[PDB]
Amino acid sequence: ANPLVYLDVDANGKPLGRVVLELKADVVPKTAENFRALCTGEKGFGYKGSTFHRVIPSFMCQAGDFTNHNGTGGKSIYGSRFPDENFTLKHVGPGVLSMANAGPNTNGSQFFICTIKTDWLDGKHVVFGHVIEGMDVVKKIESFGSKSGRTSKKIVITDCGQL
């Protein structure tokens, strides 16, 4: 079965709730495993305590830069980056979970959750999961974003793991 993982998120130290994500290990096993292991911290590093550092209304909420917390960093469980596994799954609508990158073959740890259909990212960002519960939490995160992506409050993944 595809793994389910969670992100528990605060805004300014106030809980927003839990996002439940299904990882499509059937289609993108390697990309799904990276995210799963970063949620559990099993390699000695991962998402716990890091932030949603770029949140753009009517676009997406981006997180996972646990080295620099600013969108320039992060790393994968396989090394500093790994190639795009495939582009099979598409940016079909809100709730899509997809890998951030700095161009081709630069997947590390940064990821995003879409709040609209981001079809122009098809073939450029590897989709690997979807929100199955807590989309309302994602909408709360989105409400603290801005056109530049700078957040109005400190949005923190206080805990995460595998369900």
Ligand X SMILES: NCCOCCNC(=O)[C@@H]1CCNC(=O)/C=C/C(=O)N2CCC[C@](Cc3ccccc3)(C2)C(=O)N[C@@H](Cc2ccc(C(=O)c3ccccc3)cc2)C(=O)NCc2ccccc2CC(=O)N1
Residues in contact with ligand X by CB under 6 A are 54, 56-60, 62, 71-72, 74, 80-81, 100-102, 106, 108, 110, 112, 121, 125
Q: How far is the CB of 78 from ligand X (least distance, A)?
A: 11
Nearer to ligand X, 42 or 119 (CB): 119
Catalytic residue of the set 34, 101, 107, 110: 101
Asked if residue 10 lies in contact with residue 158, where contact means CB atoms within 8 angstroms, the answer is yes
Residues 6+ apart with CB under 8 A from 127: 24, 28, 87, 88, 89, 90, 91, 96, 97, 98, 99
Angle 19-20-24 from CA coordinates, rounded to 5°? 130
Asked if residue 19 lies in contact with residue 131, where contact means CB atoms within 8 angstroms, the answer is yes
Told to judge if 53 belongs to the known catalytic residues of this protein, a careful annotator would answer no
Asked if residue 32 lies in contact with residue 98, where contact means CB atoms within 8 angstroms, the answer is no
Catalytic residue of the set 7, 38, 121, 130: 121
Catalytic residue of the set 62, 107, 111, 144: 62
Q: Which two tokens stand for residue 83?
A: 């190639």
Told to judge if 62 belongs to the known catalytic residues of this protein, a careful annotator would answer yes
Nearer to ligand X, 102 or 163 (CB): 102
Residue nearest to ligand X (CB): 108
Told to judge if 54 belongs to the known catalytic residues of this protein, a careful annotator would answer yes
Catalytically annotated residues: 54, 59, 62, 101, 112, 121, 125
